[PDB]
Design a binder for this molecule. Structure first.
Ligand SMILES: CC(C)=CCC/C(C)=C/CSP(=O)(O)OP(=O)(O)O
Ligand SMILES: [Mg+2]
Ligand SMILES: [Mg+2]
Length: 274
């Protein structure tokens, strides 16, 4: 109704890719706990999304059919989903390691601060980038099995290239997605990149993002061993990132969005067949 937990299947492989590239061993239990942490964080984030930007999502033509606006769900059920998400996440983090639990409020803070980034500065896309960066970071810090000796080790355990890359990718295709909202997001005090500079300039900034995104995905191939079955995943990904940029400049922006759904499936099946 308000939060479809099925969608989380697309956000999972970014956690596992952060866990594997840390090169620390983890158990099946650890993996299940990772998944749980992810569905919790998704639940909290998605619920509090509809909560925070509600007053300005009722005014929007585009989102007048959203739940919590029409009705369907109450504010109570939504807040309940927030508390439940935070709770599941905290539970997973605690069940995992001491460092995972230690960093869990910070990670949750990031995911819950994003919907307020609009009213502050015209870079919410970067914030989403940090958000889907925190699931990679979380996977890494949870990969250890607390095999780590100190916090100075878990922060060195994180595949920083890939989090800083998936971040820029997300920021990119969100910067693209926010073009249809250029009009609405400037009528009100809302902020975004395609509102600051025109839709053309937005695509330009989007180009700069996805460029640096592909740049890092490639740099990781050398920085790590990454075998030869993940180097086709890097290629297939970098390829897809191009089409979503291609379809964008061609005006067909709606198709430029759904193509971003491929790369999780790409690297997801890439994590499978080890
Ligand atoms: C962060 C992850 C799980 C991937 C992004 C998934 C996705 C469809 C996000 C776009 S929703 P968002 O643009 O933040 O919110 P609205 O503008 O639609 O109100
Ligand atoms: Mg909105
Ligand atoms: Mg938006």
């Amino acid at each position: 109704r308000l939060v479809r937990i099925e969608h989380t299947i697309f956000s999972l492989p970014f956690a596992y890719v952060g866990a594997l590239l840390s090169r620390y061993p983890f158990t099946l239990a650890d993996a299940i706990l990772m998944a749980a942490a992810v569905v919790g964080l998704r639940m909290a984030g998605m619920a509090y999304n509809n909560i925070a930007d509600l007053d300005i999502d009722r005014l929007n033509p585009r989102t007048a059919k959203r739940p919590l606006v029409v009705g369907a769900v109450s504010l109570r059920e939504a807040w309940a989903l927030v508390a439940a998400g935070s709770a599941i996440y905290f539970a997973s983090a605690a069940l995992l390691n001491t460092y995972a639990l230690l960093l869990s409020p910070l990670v949750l803070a990031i995911a819950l601060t994003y919907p307020h980034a609009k009213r502050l500065h015209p870079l919410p896309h970067l914030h989403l980038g940090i958000v889907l960066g925190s699931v990679v970071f979380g996977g890494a810090v949870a990969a250890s099995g607390d095999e780590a000796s100190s916090l100075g080790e878990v922060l060195r355990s994180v595949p920083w290239l890939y989090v800083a890359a998936v971040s820029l990718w997300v920021a990119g295709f969100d910067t693209i997605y926010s073009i249809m909202d250029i009009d609405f997001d400037r009528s009100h005090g809302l902020g975004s990149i395609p509102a600051l500079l025109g839709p053309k300039g937005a695509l330009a900034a989007s180009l700069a993002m996805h460029a640096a995104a592909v740049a890092l995905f490639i740099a990781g191939v050398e920085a790590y061993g990454l075998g030869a079955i993940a180097t086709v995943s890097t290629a297939l990904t970098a390829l897809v990132i191009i089409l979503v940029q291609a379809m964008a400049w061609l005006g067909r922006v709606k198709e430029s969005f759904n193509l971003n759904l491929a790369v999780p499936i790409i690297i997801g099946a890439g994590i499978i067949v080890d």
